[PDB]
Coordinates of C-alpha atoms and ligand atoms in Angstrom, one line a residue:
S2 CA -15.8 -12.5 -85.5
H3 CA -13.7 -9.8 -84.0
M4 CA -10.1 -9.4 -83.0
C5 CA -12.1 -8.1 -80.4
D6 CA -13.3 -11.5 -79.1
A7 CA -9.9 -12.8 -77.4
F8 CA -11.5 -9.5 -74.4
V9 CA -15.1 -11.1 -74.5
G10 CA -16.3 -13.4 -71.3
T11 CA -16.7 -12.6 -67.6
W12 CA -13.4 -11.8 -65.9
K13 CA -12.4 -12.2 -62.1
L14 CA -9.8 -9.8 -60.0
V15 CA -6.8 -12.2 -59.6
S16 CA -4.3 -10.0 -58.0
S17 CA -3.8 -5.5 -57.5
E18 CA -0.9 -3.4 -57.7
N19 CA -0.4 0.4 -56.7
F20 CA -4.2 0.8 -57.1
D21 CA -4.3 2.9 -54.2
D22 CA -1.8 5.4 -54.8
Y23 CA -2.9 5.6 -58.0
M24 CA -6.8 6.0 -56.8
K25 CA -4.8 9.3 -54.8
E26 CA -3.5 11.0 -57.7
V27 CA -6.8 10.9 -59.1
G28 CA -8.0 12.7 -56.2
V29 CA -10.4 10.0 -55.0
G30 CA -11.1 10.5 -51.2
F31 CA -9.7 8.0 -47.9
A32 CA -13.6 6.5 -47.6
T33 CA -13.9 5.9 -51.5
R34 CA -10.0 4.9 -51.7
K35 CA -10.5 2.5 -48.4
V36 CA -14.2 0.9 -49.7
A37 CA -13.1 0.5 -53.0
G38 CA -9.8 -1.3 -53.3
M39 CA -11.3 -3.6 -50.9
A40 CA -13.6 -4.9 -54.5
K41 CA -12.9 -8.2 -55.7
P42 CA -14.8 -7.1 -59.4
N43 CA -15.9 -9.6 -62.1
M44 CA -15.4 -7.6 -65.5
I45 CA -18.0 -8.4 -67.8
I46 CA -17.3 -7.6 -71.3
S47 CA -19.5 -8.4 -74.5
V48 CA -19.5 -7.0 -77.9
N49 CA -22.6 -6.8 -80.9
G50 CA -22.2 -5.6 -83.8
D51 CA -20.4 -1.7 -84.0
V52 CA -21.1 -1.7 -79.4
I53 CA -19.1 -3.1 -77.0
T54 CA -19.5 -2.9 -73.7
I55 CA -17.9 -3.4 -70.2
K56 CA -19.5 -4.0 -66.9
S57 CA -17.7 -3.6 -63.8
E58 CA -19.9 -5.8 -60.6
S59 CA -18.6 -5.7 -56.8
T60 CA -19.8 -5.2 -53.9
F61 CA -18.6 -1.1 -54.1
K62 CA -20.3 -0.6 -56.9
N63 CA -21.6 -2.3 -60.2
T64 CA -20.7 0.3 -63.4
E65 CA -21.7 -0.3 -67.3
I66 CA -20.3 1.4 -70.0
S67 CA -21.6 0.6 -73.3
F68 CA -19.1 2.7 -76.5
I69 CA -18.1 2.3 -80.2
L70 CA -14.4 2.5 -81.0
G71 CA -13.2 6.3 -81.4
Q72 CA -16.3 8.1 -80.0
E73 CA -16.4 10.2 -76.8
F74 CA -19.2 9.5 -74.3
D75 CA -19.4 10.9 -71.5
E76 CA -18.8 8.9 -68.2
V77 CA -19.7 8.7 -64.6
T78 CA -17.1 6.5 -63.5
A79 CA -17.9 4.8 -60.2
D80 CA -15.8 7.6 -57.7
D81 CA -18.0 9.5 -59.3
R82 CA -15.8 11.5 -61.9
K83 CA -17.8 13.4 -64.5
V84 CA -15.8 12.4 -67.1
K85 CA -15.4 12.4 -71.2
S86 CA -13.6 8.8 -72.3
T87 CA -12.2 8.0 -75.6
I88 CA -11.6 4.1 -76.4
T89 CA -9.9 2.7 -79.0
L90 CA -8.2 -0.9 -80.3
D91 CA -4.4 -0.1 -81.1
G92 CA -2.3 -2.7 -81.6
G93 CA -4.4 -5.0 -80.7
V94 CA -5.0 -3.2 -76.9
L95 CA -8.0 -1.9 -75.3
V96 CA -6.5 2.0 -74.4
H97 CA -9.2 4.5 -73.1
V98 CA -9.2 8.1 -72.2
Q99 CA -10.5 9.9 -69.2
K100 CA -10.4 13.9 -69.7
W101 CA -11.5 15.8 -66.8
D102 CA -10.6 19.3 -65.3
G103 CA -8.2 19.2 -67.6
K104 CA -6.7 15.9 -66.2
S105 CA -6.4 12.8 -67.7
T106 CA -6.0 9.0 -66.9
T107 CA -5.7 6.2 -69.6
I108 CA -6.7 2.1 -68.9
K109 CA -5.4 0.1 -71.0
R110 CA -6.6 -3.8 -71.0
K111 CA -4.9 -6.6 -72.7
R112 CA -4.7 -10.1 -73.3
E113 CA -1.5 -11.6 -72.0
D114 CA -1.1 -15.5 -71.5
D115 CA -4.9 -16.4 -69.5
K116 CA -4.9 -13.7 -68.4
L117 CA -6.5 -9.5 -68.9
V118 CA -4.0 -7.1 -67.7
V119 CA -5.7 -3.8 -66.8
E120 CA -3.2 -1.2 -66.5
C121 CA -4.3 2.5 -65.2
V122 CA -1.9 5.6 -65.4
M123 CA -1.8 8.6 -63.7
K124 CA 1.0 10.9 -64.4
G125 CA 4.1 8.6 -62.8
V126 CA 1.9 6.6 -61.0
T127 CA 0.7 2.9 -62.4
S128 CA -1.5 0.3 -61.1
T129 CA -1.6 -3.6 -62.6
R130 CA -5.1 -5.2 -61.7
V131 CA -5.1 -9.2 -63.5
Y132 CA -7.5 -10.8 -64.1
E133 CA -8.0 -14.6 -65.1
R134 CA -11.5 -16.0 -66.4
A135 CA -13.9 -16.9 -64.3
Ligands
LIG201 O1 -11.8 -2.0 -66.1 C1 -10.8 -1.2 -64.8 C2 -10.5 0.1 -64.9 C3 -9.9 0.2 -63.2 C4 -9.7 1.4 -62.9 C5 -10.9 1.7 -61.5 O2 -11.3 0.8 -61.1 N1 -10.9 3.0 -61.9 C6 -11.4 3.1 -60.2 C7 -12.8 2.2 -60.3 C8 -13.0 2.7 -58.7 C9 -12.9 4.0 -58.0 CL1 -13.8 4.4 -57.1 C10 -12.3 4.5 -58.5 C11 -11.3 4.6 -59.7 CL2 -10.0 5.3 -60.2 N2 -9.3 -1.0 -62.9 C12 -9.9 -1.8 -63.1 O3 -9.3 -3.1 -63.0 N3 -10.5 -2.2 -64.1

């Protein structure tokens, strides 16, 4: 086993707060914000050796990243930013930093009770998205 095991499985979105405002801060345009904010994604997290895979499946888009902790990779986000991403495991929290155009956003994923809580931060603006097991 791995500590990273508490994240493995299939998760469904149960609540969102401030996601439109987070997307505005990131620079997402109107139409994409409207359709992406309507989405009710599933997150599917799996581990195979050192490689972690995070898939997001919804009616808006299906995305998949695979990565090794601490090792930078290029990511095309669902809103079509070309970013440089690094994901680390800090005190039990997956911390995902995306860099592009001199900007930065951080997405933290953590286990809290039976939920997986995703916190997305762009300067002063935080969105909190709560998932539970499917
Ligand atoms: O693993 C995650 C990551 C995340 C941030 C995100 O989804 N960003 C994003 C997604 C689509 C679009 Cl159009 C624009 C942006 Cl900023 N929220 C989540 O519930 N789970």
